[PDB]
Amino acid sequence: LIVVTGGAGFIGSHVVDKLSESNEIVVIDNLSSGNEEFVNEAARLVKADLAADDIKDYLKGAEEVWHIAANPDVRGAENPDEIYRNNVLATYRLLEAMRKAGVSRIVFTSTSTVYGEAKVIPTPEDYPTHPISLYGASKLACEALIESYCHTFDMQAWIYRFANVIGRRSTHGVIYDFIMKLKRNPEELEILGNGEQNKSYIYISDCVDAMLFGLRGDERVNIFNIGSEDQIKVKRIAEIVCEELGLSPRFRFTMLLSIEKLKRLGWKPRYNSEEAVRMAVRDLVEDLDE
Amino acid sequence: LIVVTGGAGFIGSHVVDKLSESNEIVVIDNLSSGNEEFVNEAARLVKADLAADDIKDYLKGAEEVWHIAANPDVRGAENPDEIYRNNVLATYRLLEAMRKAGVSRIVFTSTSTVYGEAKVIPTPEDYPTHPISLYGASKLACEALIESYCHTFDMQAWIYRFANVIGRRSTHGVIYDFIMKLKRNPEELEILGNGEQNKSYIYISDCVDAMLFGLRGDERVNIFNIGSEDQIKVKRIAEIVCEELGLSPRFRFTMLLSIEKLKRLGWKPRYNSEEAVRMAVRDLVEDLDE
Ligand SMILES: NC(=O)c1ccc[n+]([C@@H]2O[C@H](COP(=O)([O-])OP(=O)(O)OC[C@H]3O[C@@H](n4cnc5c(N)ncnc54)[C@H](O)[C@@H]3O)[C@@H](O)[C@H]2O)c1
Ligand SMILES: NC(=O)c1ccc[n+]([C@@H]2O[C@H](COP(=O)([O-])OP(=O)(O)OC[C@H]3O[C@@H](n4cnc5c(N)ncnc54)[C@H](O)[C@@H]3O)[C@@H](O)[C@H]2O)c1
């Protein structure tokens, strides 16, 4: 019996698909940015807001909680109140619910931005955490609360930090922006910068697999970075998008984490950045139609 | 024009006394653990709850905010909701209010417990922060939020980590308990364990002088540990309490931060632990009369 908060969203729904195969799954989601159609039918969907509704009764008997729910991290035009509410408060309320209900296992999706302006790349898990963005700070705040509840109310946790996950059911970012442009005009793709900018992506299946793998970690609190073995330039992303869409437009030009910790434990990503991107472009295409 | 939250409390009142000598002070306090009588008469006392009221008219024109307000850190007998509301939520709401009012300088009293189980003593500011207590976690969360607001909304902050501050106006601590118990049976004092526990104490004036001194730090976010140069044993504390009370009961037996960063800056605590304790005891005896 496992509870998956945010199980109706991108990463969450994938987690549900994998766990539902051998666990009774209860999903808690207010569908603010999720889609109930993504939820496996073998699971029970409870439509509740972690920041305002009492959820201890939905946690009754649960052996573990995969806390995947959170506010969408956006570029700039961010709202402090929603980030606070859906990240900090929601997590605090969940921990209290877990405490009262007796649930002592939590798997949490943090974020690569807890490291702020890191001066060493690839960034290891023991690198200082001085977030500069509100989303990063909210997540580091969540990690602190989790850590303390683990020591104070005897819980065990697995915290995963990662940057950009792509794959079926996700709809935003560079790949999305390119598709929507080429749909708008198949003969020209605008690229901000000179395309030499680098990016790194982890394919969704690898994100899920890493989180499952890290569970063998047996410290009271286990922190792991998840990421790909490489990088990819925006210029190459554009080409792959054009390749899969079968196009040849005219191009108009206007935080890497170290995974050595998980790798010494025995995990390795199956896909590199280019493969993650190519598979993600195909699934996004069909996703937008579906 | 400076606003001091928690200005009716122990550390806060002393800050107000010192700052009022050359600045217009506005104290925001809900008089929970604080005493109105401790507020300097030259200051304006605004009775409000940081975690619930509209404090916009009060931050108007302020140059900086000394955020001293917070929940009492108790022993096992703590109220998560109270710690969350008076530390995390109050701080979030304050930062929002500051943002809205245009105040961009914040001085914050954090805590030594953000370091959890420090394995490096004297503990430096760059030591990892993995709190084991809800109080420590609540403060680390506050630090994260403050650091992100500084970077996102152009603010500058001075964060102070410390423990065991003693002196006039404080009523929580080993000294207070010893005097209280001694006031029952002046011929027999019960001391936990063999009382060989070392404990670094900082006298209130050194805490306040350190905070004022640290303002010289010119990074966007300045973090400093505060403390005295040494430690003192529990048994020794009991002795000094008796030495001052003029009693000779028989004893019935039932961490150190590095300040090299502030010292490099030119600050030095005036009193060692024994001196802070001796002065604090006399301060309390006289406090109990008022
Ligand atoms: N997608 C990425 O690239 C990425 C990168 C780093 C970290 N993360 C983290 O991974 C987690 C999942 O991200 P995602 O991409 O799948 O986003 P998402 O928006 O698809 O999934 C989050 C789900 O949480 C639910 N939710 C939000 N607030 C809620 C509340 N108060 N009560 C109940 N449900 C609530 C939403 O309805 C949504 O379905 C988040 O915690 C996020 O911070 C994602
Ligand atoms: N005294 C110590 O040994 C020590 C050690 C470490 C950290 N600190 C930190 O130093 C700061 C001051 O500690 P203190 O010893 O003076 O404690 P204190 O309890 O005397 O002072 C806190 C003040 O905050 C006010 N307050 C609390 N909640 C409030 C709210 N919601 N709205 C408005 N006012 C509110 C109280 O009325 C009180 O006057 C705190 O942030 C504390 O965590 C103190």
* CATH number for the domain that contains residue A11: 3.40.50.720
CA distance B237 to A32: 57
Tell me, yes or no, whether A222 and A270 share the same domain: no
Tell me, yes or no, whether A45 and A64 share the same domain: yes
Closest residue on chain B to A133 (Cα): B148
The three-state secondary structure class of B69 is: coil
> Minimal Cα–Cα distance from A245 to chain B, Å?
38
Cα A166 versus chain centre, distance: 9
| Cα B271 to middle of ligand 2, angstroms | 23
Name the residue range of residue A58's domain: 1-166+200-227
Structure tokens, A286: 């069909």
Tell me, yes or no, whether B25 and B96 share the same domain: yes
Write the CB contacts of B289 (distance below 8 Å, at least 6 apart in sequence).
none
* Cβ contact A131–B141 (<8 Å): no
Tell me, yes or no, whether B28 and B82 share the same domain: yes
- Chain A positions contacting chain B at CB under 8 Å are 80-81, 84, 88-89, 92, 96, 99, 116, 126, 128-134, 136-138, 140-141, 144-145, 147-149, 151-152, 221
Tell me, yes or no, whether B115 and B174 share the same domain: no
B287 is in an annotated binding site: no
Tell me, yes or no, whether A204 and A283 share the same domain: no
Tell me, yes or no, whether A174 and A214 share the same domain: no
Could you give the C-alpha distances from A137 to A53, A88, A225, B141, in angstroms and in order? 24, 9, 17, 8
CA distance B239 to B245: 10
* Three-state SS letters, chain A: CEEEECCCCHHHHHHHHHHCCCCCEEEECCCCCCCHHHCCCCEEEECCCCCCCCCHHHHCCCCEEEECCCCCCCCCCCCHHHHHHHHHHHHHHHHHHHHHHCCCEEEEECCHHHHCCCCCCCECCCCCCCCCCHHHHHHHHHHHHHHHHHHHCCCEEEEEECCCEECCCCCCCHHHHHHHHHHHCCCEEEECCCCCCEECCEEHHHHHHHHHHHCCCCCCEEEEECCCCCCEEHHHHHHHHHHHCCCCCEEEECCCECCHHHHHHCCCCCCCHHHHHHHHHHHHHHHHHC
Tell me, yes or no, whether B210 and B238 share the same domain: no
CA distance A53 to A215: 29
Tell me, yes or no, whether B157 and B273 share the same domain: no
Tell me, yes or no, whether B179 and B88 share the same domain: no
The three-state secondary structure class of B27 is: strand
Number of compact structural domains in chain A: 2
Amino acid in the structure at residue B92? Y
Which element (helix H / strand E) includes B15? helix B10-20
Tell me the ligand closest to B70's alpha carbon.
2
Q: Is any atom of ligand 1 closer than 6 Å to the C-beta of A73?
A: yes
Tell me, yes or no, whether A220 and A272 share the same domain: no
Cis amide prior to A249 (ω within 30 degrees): no
- Domain termination site, one of B210, B227, B244: B227
The approach used to solve this structure was X-ray
Q: Is any atom of ligand 1 closer than 6 Å to the C-beta of A30?
A: yes
When CB atoms are compared, the residue of B89, B96, B147 closest to A131 is B147
> Minimal Cα–Cα distance from A3 to chain B, Å?
23
CA distance A190 to A252: 5
Tell me, yes or no, whether B136 and B275 share the same domain: no
The CATH number of residue B179's host domain is 3.90.25.10
